[PDB]
Ligand binder design. Structure first.
Ligand SMILES: [Zn+2]
Ligand SMILES: [Zn+2]
Lengths: 220, 32, 225, 32
């Protein structure tokens, strides 16, 4: 019953020490087996099914999913879930911040968020557009769900979808090379580090940002 | 009792879905 | 360096939560993978190479290795192998040393202490004996490791261990007859009971007197009224 | 720097021996 709670809580506390980094989390090969075993245990834990997931889990997932330390799996269901967890991070940031440099960082997160969210939605869309045949239902269903702030860009991708493979690749290939992924990797990485910094400083989380705070106090 | 997945003893919830997504990324990166 | 220290201490705290039992620890299917992963992580952890192992690990090991049960039988779950059983006796000795040390520093205290001592000597001797039985039934006998085992773990019992060394020179049928007869007289279930009681008695002492938590609250509650 | 095993990064000590012993018993009970 609730010994299973205590075991699961303890397994979660171990993940917290493996996942919360100063910089970004990645699967080092010496930790894959235990991290996997911890995730599988929580995943099948009866007591954890309706439990509020800590925000360090979502952050570690985003860091892992987008390799922030062809490595990103551009799959509909996965990126949709990834965007949902990125949203969970942002809501938690907003709530915790709502309680000079406070507003500078708060605004920086808001701009990096939308820009990162756009980048993810865009590159998922590019991946829909590279397939043959296209899945028009899911492509549309994805744009409706996630790109509703960048509506004119999605309108343009929607009417690009009517063209056959050759022209789709030429638009996608040229637009990939105008703004490459490295831009969004950098924006996304910065949103995570900026969110971590805010939450530790003001909202009393612990993201191992003590050394980062001392460097900003030094004046560089 | 209310949650029929709980009654059935089947896995579900945030931690399970996180698990599935994490595994997909691994499977993808293991032969890349 | 310090970060992997912290991570190893956390893996160890998670193991504590899986291993410490009211009754005795056994490996359940749904915990196999995480228990194995935690044990491998600690086994290769650089920061753990010279850390003293907490006593719950030794206890769990002993419960698992000898497949200890209180209430209830399983066919041959104990691996009678020289190196394993020698390491097991070492870990039992560590439990005893920890218990003795902590009992130096209410009215049932002397009794619990003395009962643990009797149980330790009997458990130790029983494990010795059953390891010796195994050696005696090998064909040929591993005389180097056999003699080594008795020196290391049969110093207190030097009277009995003279006979086994003479017995090891006789042929297989004679050794099999001896072992057969000595097993019928004092079967393993007697030593399962002795070990189980040693371990459970030790857990209680350590909990009540020496500030451990070994989930014995119900035994302590009954010992009040 | 006293420990040559620590200098070479090779596994050793109590937790390592526990692991090996633990593995030996699991091996024995899956076969059996
Ligand atoms: Zn449920
Ligand atoms: Zn060393």
């Amino acid at each position: 019953g609730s010994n299973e709670k205590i075991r699961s809580q303890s397994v979660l506390n171990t993940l917290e020490t493996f996942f919360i980094k100063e910089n970004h989390y990645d699967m080092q090969r010496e930790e894959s087996s235990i991290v996997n075993a911890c995730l599988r245990y929580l995943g099948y834990s009866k007591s954890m099914c309706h439990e509020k997931m800590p925000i360090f889990m979502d952050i570690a997932f985003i860091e892992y999913c987008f390799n922030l330390s062809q490595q990103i799996l551009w799959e509909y269901s996965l990126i949709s879930n990834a965007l949902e967890r990125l949203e969970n991070i942002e809501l938690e940031r907003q709530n915790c911040m709502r309680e000079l440099n406070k507003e500078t960082l708060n605004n920086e997160a808001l701009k990096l968020y939308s820009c990162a969210k756009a980048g993810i939605c865009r590159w998922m869309a590019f991946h829909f557009l590279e397939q043959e045949p296209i899945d028009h239902i899911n492509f549309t269903k994805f744009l409706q769900d996630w790109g509703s702030h960048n509506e004119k860009e999605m309108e343009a991708l929607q009417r690009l979808s009517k063209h056959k493979i050759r022209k789709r690749l030429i638009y996608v290939s040229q637009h990939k090379k105008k703004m490459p992924w490295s831009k969004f990797n950098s924006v996304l990485s910065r949103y995570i580090q900026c969110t971590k910094l805010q939450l530790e400083v003001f909202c009393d989380y612990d993201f191992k940002q003590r050394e980062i705070v001392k460097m900003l106090t030094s004046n560089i | 009792e209310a949650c029929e997945m709980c009654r059935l003893g089947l896995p579900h919830g945030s931690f399970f879905e996180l698990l599935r997504d994490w595994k997909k990324i691994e499977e993808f990166r293991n032969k890349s």
